[PDB]
Design a protein around this ligand. Structure first.
Ligand SMILES: [Zn+2]
Lengths: 98, 282, 96, 168, 91, 346, 49
DNA sequence: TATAATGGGAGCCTCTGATGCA
DNA sequence: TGCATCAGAGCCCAAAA
């Protein structure tokens, strides 16, 4: 929860938050490559008794040396008034850091 | 231009056969040909025409050239050229020399001249001309794949036109198109117009282009490389330094030495092990 | 480039500098363990995190690329030992 | 062993075939729906090796220690995927094609061996003119056709097919 | 210059018009849009044999509009078209 | 020096046919095919095999090759053998051989004389992703198809029939070869329909249509989601060699990371995990280490069912689940005590 | 200049459509394809130097 | 698968060496 | 044989994008 502290319910960093290198700006999950459950990871996951999740953490993070105060967020989904994205793109998030 | 050989009974040849003087045409051997030519069997006029023409073997393309290359005895040509090296004329001795140097090259090396003509064309491993999904799920691919595709399409079409017995005009156009396609793959732009992708003026990048030039394989990746454990920043004067010293920003030094720092973080208790230490630096 | 977390380019002129200094092992690192030598760069990281010294380098992968690209041009490139016997830099993977 | 020497030499059609792990028979690259490589195409896994380590295409033999198995169903060897950087394919041409380096690099090496000029070698390779292997006693304009002589299309047809003519 | 486009079909150019921009400048920058106007052209089709005339205003797409300060908005980004010096035509 | 110009010059050396000449060649071609059928009856030989032998002798020794459909490899030995059976026919039968021979000859001339037609059709299809000469050759392929199917009795001129087949051949080539990622011909038709539809919609609406508007215009079966999916499939790849700003100094592919080969850090991590995993499995019994390897796939990579794992060790489906639990239990105990596997949980 | 190029290209499509189509039913909307024109301007603004 | 249709279309610096010419 | 003409070969680095 320390890592997610400054993310809102939807996963976007809150306006006014201070972001430093490594911090999450927008949380995102991606479905694991079809090879994914390596046999090594299967046994490791089994030892701790936690099912390996179907999705991996692809979240957008602050690059090395960057960061600042979050002054804006723009979120655009598919199926909302006025917006149509390029084919295949469900939603686009932009974060302006000052 | 034909000789006319009327026939009462059955004719032993058929239209398209090639014939030399004396070959039996029809009527059990009675009528035979006086000239060299092509047999035209007329069932209306009841006559066997032989159109005057020869069985000459003359070819076009790399097939002809490959034959002439096979028909070389390099020892013999060396002898000829050695005799030419004695001729009084300055230009004559020079020309026999240049020729003799290529011949001797093949002789010493063990290469057969006909290998300069390709029958099987190699196909580069796929990972060296990759098809990769970029960020957006979009695909980015090497130009070589299109050059190969042109080649394969034209080759397959050539196989089909041959099996279906197309006229020589069709086969010749196809064959010359096939040579150009191999040419584009190996060295594009070398001979003739550079092959381009549709709706772009950019010549496709062939194998020769990859090897040579400032951007080529030798100068870009071989005589020089991008390297790890490296960094860059703005420089500032340091009057207080001793001659053997420099100021290095700590944030730069932590990345450049990161693996060393992880091990040292293990000797001291700063992290339980190397994996935890890296996780702490993120 | 900085945006890709890139490494610095050690170019033709930089190699000359290392050559003129006679720094053969420093230069060899740039050409192998610190770039496209895959086995070498992997082994070097593991050694540094274990406190061992970095191992002797292997064939740079971009030379293998060069070899296969010359094969695509119908040229046979052969690495030989002192006896002129072939030396296989693909370690059996590309030969049947 | 230590590499002390690098030789470079011409490659025979036989040798090019000995390198090759398969013939690429189709211009196809990857399937538009599955995104997997097309069989017999430029990315085919049956030729250049498995996309994923120790896993065949259809996924019947998925693990190590099976190195060297070739799946009967999908035809892919179970080995390291690194091999897709190494294994060569080949295309078998229906007609020989000249390697342009040995044609267009002056002075031409092919041209030099056969005593053929740049123009002559061009004319044969690019189907502008015939070259005679066996005149078989042909004659054109009173003189016998000599081997390695260049004939135009009109000249060859008069020799080969005769000089017929149709007058309206 | 392009019209009339001859063969007995002949297509002639009457006049063009530029509409108003679908989105204001600020909005285009926000949405990664080009600031542009719809271009239409009034064309009359003539059949030289028949005399038949069908006339219609065809939509040719959009043309980018320059803002007040002399720049453009192309896919959301501000751009400048730099003047080019060259040899004057002549003898 | 110009491959199109050269081909055009060769095309111009074959005079165009007169209506009489055209009808004659077509007539001889039809008669020749009927003869090949008849020659098949007499001999009991494959009609196709006979046809290739007839065709072989007309084209000459120059072209002799194996034909994919022929059951026997076709080489000068076999065509001489088969030709000798044909030359063994009685006069009234042996005449059909002569008919077939003359048929192939006329086929050749008819094709050669119509080549200029293909050029005039092909020139109209440039810019669709195939080179001009490529279009000419596919068009020529259709012309060959046309010569075999032409029925001269209908009194239509040949150009009428050919044009259909030539247009068909060119359009199939464009649909088949134009894309680096090949698309089924029917799917290309739908994509092109969507283009035409969207372009029409943009011409009435004064702006590009949305996904929803195209679905309406496309009729029943089409919603906005399907228009989008169709556009995604229709995207063509972009060159890795695409230049990037600067000058002629960088390529687009140079900015694309390699996700397949492990990075030194990632490769190191996975290797260390396998070795630490084996360390823990050596602290079990041989049977309970094998049971875990078999259940989680550290062998073949697949997770075996209890029924299969039980059958390999000779125990009950419940037993292998039990030895797995004490294995994981012994494994879990060693972990809290030795803290070896903690760091790999990320 | 780029407009003029796209316009010339549009004319090629027009002339080519005035042959293969119906000599009876043709509008200016059926005769004109603006894609070549849109592309020339789009090319100039996005990719010109 | 059938009215007839039959030949394309375009363009913006210096040294060195081979090739084609009195 | 000695001179002209043309095709083909090159044209800074790193940084950035
Ligand atoms: Zn399989």
């Amino acid at each position: 929860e320390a890592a997610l502290r400054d993310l809102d319910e939807e996963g976007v960093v809150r306006i006014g938050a201070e972001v430093k290198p490594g911090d999450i700006l927008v949380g995102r999950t991606s479905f694991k490559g079809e090879s994914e459950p390596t046999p090594e990871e299967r046994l490791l996951r089994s030892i701790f008794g936690e099912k390996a999740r179907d999705v991996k953490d692809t979240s957008l993070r602050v690059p090395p040396g960057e960061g600042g105060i979050v002054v804006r967020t723009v979120r655009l989904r598919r199926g909302d008034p006025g917006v149509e994205l390029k084919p295949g793109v469900r939603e686009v998030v932009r974060v302006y850091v000052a | 231009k034909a000789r006319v050989y009327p026939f009462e009974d059955d004719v032993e040849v058929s239209t398209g056969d090639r014939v030399a003087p004396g070959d039996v045409l029809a009527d059990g051997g009675k009528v035979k040909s006086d000239v060299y030519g092509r047999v035209e069997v007329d069932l209306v006029r009841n006559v066997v025409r032989v159109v005057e023409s020869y069985d000459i073997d003359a070819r076009m393309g790399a097939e002809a050239i490959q034959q002439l290359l096979k028909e070389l005895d390099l020892e013999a040509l060396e002898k000829e050229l050695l005799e030419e090296m004695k001729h009084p004329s300055r230009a004559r001795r020079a020309k026999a020399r240049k020729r003799l140097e290529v011949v001797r090259a093949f002789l010493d090396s063990g290469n057969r001249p006909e290998w300069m003509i390709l029958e099987a064309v190699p196909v580069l491993p796929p990972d060296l001309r990759p098809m990769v999904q970029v960020d957006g799920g979009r695909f980015a691919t090497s130009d070589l794949n299109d050059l190969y595709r042109r080649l394969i399409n034209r080759n397959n079409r050539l196989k089909k036109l041959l099996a279906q017995g197309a006229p020589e005009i069709i086969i010749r156009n196809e064959k010359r198109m096939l040579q150009e396609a191999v040419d584009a793959l190996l060295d594009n732009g070398r001979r003739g117009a550079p092959v381009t992708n549709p709706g772009s003026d950019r010549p496709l990048r062939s194998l020769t282009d990859i090897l040579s030039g400032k951007q080529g394989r030798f100068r870009q990746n071989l005589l020089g490389k991008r390297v790890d454990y490296s960094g860059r920043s703005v420089i500032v004067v340091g009057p207080q330094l001793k001659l053997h010293q420099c100021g290095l920003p700590k944030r730069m030094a932590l990345e450049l030495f990161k693996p060393f720092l992880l091990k040292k973080m293990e000797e001291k208790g700063i992290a339980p092990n190397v994996k935890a230490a890296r996780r702490m630096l993120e | 480039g900085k945006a890709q977390f890139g490494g610095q380019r050690f170019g033709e002129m930089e190699v000359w500098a290392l050559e003129a200094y006679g720094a053969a092992h420093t230069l060899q690192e740039m050409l192998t363990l610190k770039s496209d030598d895959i086995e070498g760069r992997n082994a070097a990281y593991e050694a540094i995190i274990k406190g061992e010294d970095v191992p002797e380098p292997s064939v740079p992968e971009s030379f293998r690329v060069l070899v296969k690209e010359l094969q695509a041009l119908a040229l046979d490139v052969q690495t030989l030992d002192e006896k002129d016997n072939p030396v296989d830099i693909f370690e059996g993977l590309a030969s049947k | 062993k230590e590499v002390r020497k690098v030789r470079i030499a011409l490659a025979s059609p036989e040798k090019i075939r000995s390198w090759s792990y398969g013939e690429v028979e189709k211009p196809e690259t990857i399937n538009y729906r599955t995104l997997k490589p097309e069989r017999d195409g430029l990315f085919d896994e049956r030729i250049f090796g498995p996309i994923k380590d120790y896993e065949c295409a259809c996924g019947k033999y998925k693990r190590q220690r099976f190195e060297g198995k070739v799946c009967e169903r999908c035809g892919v060897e179970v080995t390291k995927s690194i091999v897709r950087r190494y294994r060569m394919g080949h295309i078998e041409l229906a007609t020989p094609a000249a390697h342009i380096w040995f044609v267009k690099d002056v002075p031409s090496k092919i041209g030099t061996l056969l005593d053929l000029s740049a123009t002559e070698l061009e004319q044969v390779l690019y189907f502008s003119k015939y070259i005679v292997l066996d005149p078989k006693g042909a004659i054109l304009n009173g003189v016998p056709v000599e081997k390695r002589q260049l004939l135009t299309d009109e000249e060859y047809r008069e020799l080969r097919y005769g000089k017929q003519e149709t007058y309206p | 210059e392009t019209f009339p486009i001859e063969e007995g079909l002949v297509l002639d150019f009457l006049e063009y018009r530029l509409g108003e921009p679908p989105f204001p400048q600020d909005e285009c920058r926000e949405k990664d849009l080009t600031y542009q106007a719809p271009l239409y052209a009034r064309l009359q089709l003539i059949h030289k044999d028949t005399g038949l005339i069908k006339e219609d205003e065809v939509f040719l797409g959009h043309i980018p509009l320059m803002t007040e300060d002399g720049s453009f908005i192309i896919n959301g980004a501000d751009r400048v078209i730099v003047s080019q010096i060259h040899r004057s035509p002549g003898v | 020096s110009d491959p199109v110009r050269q081909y055009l010059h060769e095309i111009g050396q074959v005079p165009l046919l007169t209506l009489e000449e055209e009808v004659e060649l077509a007539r001889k071609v039809e008669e020749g095919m009927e003869a090949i059928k008849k020659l098949s009856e007499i001999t009991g030989l494959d009609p196709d095999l006979i046809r290739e032998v007839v065709r072989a002798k007309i084209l000459g020794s120059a072209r002799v090759r194996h034909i994919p459909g022929l059951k026997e490899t076709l080489d000068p030995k076999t065509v001489e053998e088969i030709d000798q059976k044909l030359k063994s026919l009685p006069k009234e039968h042996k005449r059909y051989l002569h008919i077939a021979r003359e048929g192939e000859a006329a086929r050749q001339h008819l094709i050669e004389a119509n080549l200029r037609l293909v050029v005039s059709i092909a020139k109209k299809y440039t810019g669709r992703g195939l080179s001009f000469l490529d279009l000419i050759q596919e068009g020529n392929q259709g012309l060959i198809r046309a010569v075999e199917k032409f029925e001269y009795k209908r009194r239509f001129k040949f150009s009428t029939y050919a044009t259909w087949w030539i247009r068909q051949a060119i359009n199939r080539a464009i649909a088949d070869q134009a894309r680096t990622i090949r698309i089924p011909v029917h799917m290309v038709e739908t994509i092109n329909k969507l283009s035409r539809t969207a372009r029409q919609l943009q011409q009435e609406l004064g702006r590009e249509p949305t996904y929803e508007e195209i679905a309406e215009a496309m009729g029943p079966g089409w919603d906005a989601k399907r228009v989008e999916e169709t556009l995604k499939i229709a995207q063509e790849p972009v060159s890795l060699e695409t230049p990037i700003g600067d000058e002629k100094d960088s390529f687009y592919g140079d900015f694309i990371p390699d996700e397949h080969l492990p990075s030194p850090v990632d490769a190191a991590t996975q290797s260390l995990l396998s070795e630490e995993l084996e360390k823990a499995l050596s602290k079990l019994s041989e049977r309970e280490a094998m049971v875990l390897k078999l259940r989680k796939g550290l062998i073949d990579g697949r997770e075996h069912t209890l029924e299969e794992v039980g059958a390999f060790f000779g125990v009950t489906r419940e037993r292998i689940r039990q030895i797995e639990n004490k294995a994981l239990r012994k494994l879990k105990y060693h972990e809290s005590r030795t803290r070896k596997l903690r760091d790999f949980l990320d | 200049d780029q407009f003029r190029v796209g316009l010339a290209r549009l004319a090629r499509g027009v002339r080519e459509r005035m042959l293969m189509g119906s000599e009876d039913s043709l509008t200016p909307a059926k005769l004109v394809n603006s894609r070549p024109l849109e592309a020339a301007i789009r090319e100039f603004f996005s990719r010109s130097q």
